Each structure stands twice: as C-alpha cells, then as structure tokens.
Symmetry: C4
Subunit: 219 residues, 4 copies
C-alpha cells in the first residue's frame, strides 16, 4: 500500500488540489474579516475552515509516511507541519493569538508553489553573508541602548525609561522616523548636548546600513 | 487615396505638428488652473481644447487606416487611442474624473517623442523581473493585513478597522512614514506587544525591498 | 609687462595666497553670525571683508588679462567672476539676498583647490545621463500637479490650491515626508478615494528614482 | 620572566578568558539598568565590576611588556587602553558621562574577537575614499548653515537662531525628517520664498548622497 499512496502523494493532482485549497482558504480568510459577511455565512466558513484543516493534517500525515526522516530535514515541510499544528490548537484557552496565527497557513502558497520557494530561498540565502554586520549592529545597539537608558531614562521614561524602551526608540531613530522634532529636539530642552549622542549614532547606523546594502550588491 | 494619406501621416511635418499641439494644449491646461485666467480667456481655451481634441481624433482616425491591425498591437498607439477617447466623453454626466483624466493626454508627449519612448520602455522592461518579488509581497501584505484587522481593528478602527484600511496603514508603515509616534506607540498604549508585530514586519518588508533594488542593479 | 604679470598670476604663491584668503574670509563669515561678536569687532570685519573683495576683483582683473577669451570659456573662472560680482553690489538698495548671497564666495574654496574640482566635476558629469529621467519626471509631476489642483484645491487650498502649491505638496509626498497622516488621511476624510491618486503616484515616482539610482550605478 | 609571561599573554586561554569577562561584564551592565535589580544585588555587581576593571588593567599592563612600542602603534590596542582608562577615572567628580562612557568597554568584544575586527576594518577602510565628498559636503553645509542663520534666525531663532542651530536643522532637513510640515511650511508663512532655499538644498544633498552610495558600491 506504500507505493499506492506514494503515487497519490507525488501526484500532480494532489499537489494541485492543495494549491487549490490554499487559494480557497485564503479567499475565505479575507471574508472572515467582514463583520457583515460573518453575520450571513459565518457558519458556512467556520466548517469549511475546519474541513480544510483536516485535509491538511491528512496530507501532512500522508506526506510523512512517503518521506519519513527525509521530511523532517526539509525546511518547507517542517514549516507546513508547524503551520498546520498551530491551526490545530483548539479555538479556546491559552492565548488567542493562536487563533490569529492560523492565517499563517496562507504561507503554504509560498511552500506548495515553486519559483516562490526559489524567490524565498534566494532572499534567505543572502542572510548568512550579513550575519557579521547584523552581529556588529546588535552589539552597537545594545551598547547605546544601555547608555541612553542611563542618560535620558529618568526625565524621559516613556522613551528611554527601560532597556527595552531604549531599544525601541533607537530603532525608531534609525528608521529616521520623526527622530528630530519627535525625540531629540525635546531631549535637548533638558539635555542640550543630547545631539552629541544621536548624530554620531545616526551616521554610524546609516553608514553600516549603507555598507550592508553594498555587500548585498557585491554577492 | 491610401498612399496619399499614408504619406501625410508618416510625414515629419505631421508628427512635429502633433508634438506642437501637445506642448500647446499642455501649456493651455496649466493656464486653466488659474481662476483669474479662466475669468478672462476661459472661452478662448475651451474652444482651443475642443479643437485639439478633434485634430487628435482625426489623427487617430488617419493613423488607423495607415496601420489597421498593426495599430491595435502597438502599446504606444493603443495608449493614445484610449487617452483621446477619455477626452471625448462629454463634459457632463457619469463622473467628473473623466473631465480631470483628460489631462492624461499630455502623456502623448511621451508617446510621440522617442528617447522618452526609450526611457519609459527602459523602465517598464525592469518590471517583469520584479513580478516574482512583487507577488511575494502582496501575499505577505495580504497575510499581515488580515492579521492586523483582527488584532487591532476593534479599538483602532480608523487604522485597521477594515481589510482595506489595514492595507493602507501597512503601506504607510512600509514607507516608514510617522510609523512609530504615529501608529505603533499609540498601539502599544493598549497592546503592549504590538511591537512584536510591526518590527518583524518592518525588517522583512525593508529587506525584501533592498533585495529588489539589488536585483534591478544586476540586470 | 604681460609676461611679468603672467608670471605673477600663474605663480604658486599667488594661488596659495588666494586660497589663504578664502579660508580667512570664511572663518570671518562664521563670526559675523554672532550678534555678540559684531558688537565688539563688527567694524574690524566689515572692512576686512571689503578688503578681500578688492583683492578678489584685482585677481579676477589680473586673471582675465592673462587668459582673455580662454577665461570666459572656463566654468570655474566664470563662476568666480559671477560670485565676486554678486559681492560687488552695494550693501544697499534692491534685495538683501544679494547681501546674503555674498557667502557664496566660499565656494571659491571648491574652485581654487583641486581635487574638489575633481569631485565636483565627477558629480556634475553624472547629470547628463539623468536628463532623460529628469525630463520624464518633470512631465509627470506637471501632469499630476495639474490633476491635483483641480481635484483637491477647493477644499484643500493650502496644499493643492494653486499649481505651484500642488507642486510643493507633490514634492513632499515624494520625499515621503509625513505624506499619510500629514496629507492623505486628511484628504480622505473628504475624498475617500484620494488614495487612488497618491499610492500609484508613490510607486511610479519611487520606482523611477530607484532606476535613476541603478542608472548612475552603471555609468 | 619575559618569555614566561609572553607565553601567558599570547595564550589562547588568556584571550578566551578576556572574551569571557567582556560577555560577563556586559551581561552585568544590562542588569545595572534594572532599578529592581540594583536594590537586590547592586552591591554584588559593583564589586564584580571593579574586579573586572582591575583584571583589565593588569591585562593591558601585561600586554604592553610583551609588545612595548608595537602596542602603541596598534589601533585595536590603543582603543583597549583608552577604553579601560575611561573606566579608571573614579566614580566621582567632573563630568558623570565618564561613568556612563564606561559601557564603551563592551566594544572590546569587537576588539578581542576577530571576524568583528575584520568587519569593522572592512567598514572603516571605505572612509578614506569618501573624504573628498565629506569635505565637499561640510563646506556645503557651512555655507548654507550661514545663509540660513542670517535669513531666518530672527523670526525663527529656535531653528536657525545660531550657527550651530542652523547646522542641526539643516542636518534634519537632509535626513528628510518632518522637513516640510515641521520646518518649511512654517517658514513660508513668513518668508514665502524659503522654498527657494530648501528644495535646491535637498536636491544637492540627496544627489551627493546617492553618488557617495554608488561610489562605495564600486570600490
Ligand atoms: Ca523617511
Ligand atoms: Ca508629526
Ligand atoms: Ca518621516
Ligand atoms: Ca512626521
Ligand atoms: Ca503633530
């Protein structure tokens, strides 16, 4: 019976039947957004949802016999596994992000369809070459996040009052979002020299960021 | 009579006469902006407008005899047909954007002059090699846009209340426009963890965009 | 006497003397900023200024005899002419920008010291290959600017009320500066679909600019 | 005894021991942020802190016998010296940023661990090739900084009232942060033409910046 199902699993029909369901459950997840629609056909789509969820566990079950160990060394398969597992946690208890995390299954459209996998893989592959930079920056953030917390966090606890808070604010300065009128012009009303902290911070972080982009256009 | 007009249409005089009208109507459209001007010479330039619009239909009519099916497979020609047709719809009824969309005819200065044609084409050609990235993103946007609507849309209906609104807000976060003091700091007053949703969103979306820029700087 | 002064002008000492003055008059111009400083040495500097201005007219007079027509075909020299010329208009009558435009003479530090000339020329040389794009864009801005004046200028006359106003607002949207909370969210409170105008605008204009960056990074 | 210690200093165990303390003292500094933690184990940490600071001086002392002059010609060694030196100035007196500047020792993780040194060096090496442009720009900022102080500083002293202030505001316009609604639209309410100063400013500065990015993506 092994080869019987191994022929079902590897079938073009099977994979295309899956891709057909993702597009249906996705279209249907956009509809669950409408408070109007849920009042009409909510029950329609709640069942349809649970239906697809079963089909998806069946597939993942079927897919596992055919591949066994090979399956748990496949990124795309591991994913699919975890994205359905999430979709299995009972519509109750614990946290309700799990209810919301269910929409992550539409990323199976990324998994089930090549070229997407290609493009995704293409992107991801660029990350290891960046890890030296990324490491560098996080040390840098961490160092400044600490200084800022202990330099501005007393008078300005919304923005720098906590280590995590400083992280957030520093990220925001880095994205250059309302950084001057929003954060630093205020700070200087109390700490005239704060510009001495943030302009060097900005150069460095934008510089590094420019290099990183340049590194991705070398490789 | 065919070759007679085929020698009128293909003539340098004809083309340069058309180009002369575009720059003229275009100048006249900048003038129709002034409430002062319209109070003095508005009559002058409405008639001038109808005149050029005739001339352009006459031309487009002529151009079709000389090319027939060759014409409705020309991107640039199809355009002018459409753009002139818009300018034909009666200054009345339906909507008024049809009155406003008339100014689109000044894009004929792009159509009727090479180098422009070249430059535009150079740009457009870059698009197909982006469709794999672009597709990826729209899946991504759609996914998060749904998540956001069900996570933040009840308390924050102006921003995330409806799917389309989440799209709009997510776009804005992506252009990095006032994203922290404008949207996420507010969000955190109610949902402390909202940063867990938007910082990852930012990295991904900005990363992908960096890749796409690098992709265009390879090909 | 021609070769006597052709040996004075072309002298290393002559040039290095000029360069010495630029740095001095520049230093002295940063000091005329202080209302404090002007109250104690204001006169010291006003005369020092008039002095250097003569020395510069003398040089330009000298430089012209040694070069005649060769001079008025030199970008860098023409510059210093027009720049020194500005500084000759009397501290009175007309406009007072002319008084302010005097500090443009510090650009002579660029003109009279090589390597700067290199980099400046390096930069400038890139412009011709952008003229097709720069033209393309200005046509684009112009068409949208007209559309916006007639679509939003009645309710929103500060931002779109005049052809020039629309230009400015459009520029700002393009630099992506406070474009959504600042301009488009307001607009949508009256014109729900305004997003149909501004999102495509952003794509095109940002796209084009990505290409322009890619174009420069090829040539 | 020289070669005895030269074999101590050059030992892998030595370097690794140093790297251990950095990560430990660095972990300790993140905790020194917590107002809670300090009440609990603040003392525990301040002693451990001074301990590490002792150890680090010993190392730097040792490191010098083994390298002498070779050391004070090493960028990375000079740093470690200058950084440990900062941490040596007593917890009292003068400026208390010195207490804060202590956390700069976590940059020793950059110093003691290669790959980091590599990446830093990679970044730093790009700088010399930018000095012509950076010089160009600072002259540019300086000239505009002066014009602005004398053009807008009377009515708008917060933003332009002083040379340094103009510097700050101009930097902010350059980062394109809230530049239009935050600064120039205001300006224009009084000085209608301020746009003639700031749009050209923006073009130039953004142009130059794009060149510098491309310039790096070549070398
Ligand atoms: Ca920005
Ligand atoms: Ca704001
Ligand atoms: Ca901004
Ligand atoms: Ca803003
Ligand atoms: Ca505000």
């Amino acid at each position: 019976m092994y080869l019987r199902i191994t022929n079902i699993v590897e079938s073009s029909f099977f994979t295309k039947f899956i891709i057909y369901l993702i597009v249906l459950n996705g279209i249907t997840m956009g509809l669950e957004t409408s408070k109007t629609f849920m009042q009409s056909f909510g029950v329609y789509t709640t069942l349809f949802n649970q239906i697809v969820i079963t089909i998806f566990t069946i597939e993942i079950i079927l897919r596992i016999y055919v591949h066994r160990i090979s399956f748990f060394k496949d990124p795309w398969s591991l994913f699919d596994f975890f994205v359905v597992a999430i979709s299995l946690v009972p519509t109750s208890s614990g946290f309700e992000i799990l209810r919301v995390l269910r929409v992550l299954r539409l990323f199976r459209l990324v998994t089930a369809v090549p070229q997407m996998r290609k493009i995704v893989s293409a992107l991801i592959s660029v990350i290891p070459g960046m890890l030296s930079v990324i490491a560098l920056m996080t040390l840098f953030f961490y160092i400044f996040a600490i200084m800022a917390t202990q330099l501005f966090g007393e008078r300005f606890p919304e923005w720098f009052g906590t280590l995590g808070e400083s992280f957030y604010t520093l990220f925001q300065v880095m994205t250059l979002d309302d950084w001057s009128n929003g954060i630093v012009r205020p700070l200087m009303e109390v700490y005239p020299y704060a510009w001495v902290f943030f302009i060097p911070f900005i150069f460095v972080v934008t510089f590094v960021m420019i290099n990183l982009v340049v590194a991705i256009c070398v490789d």
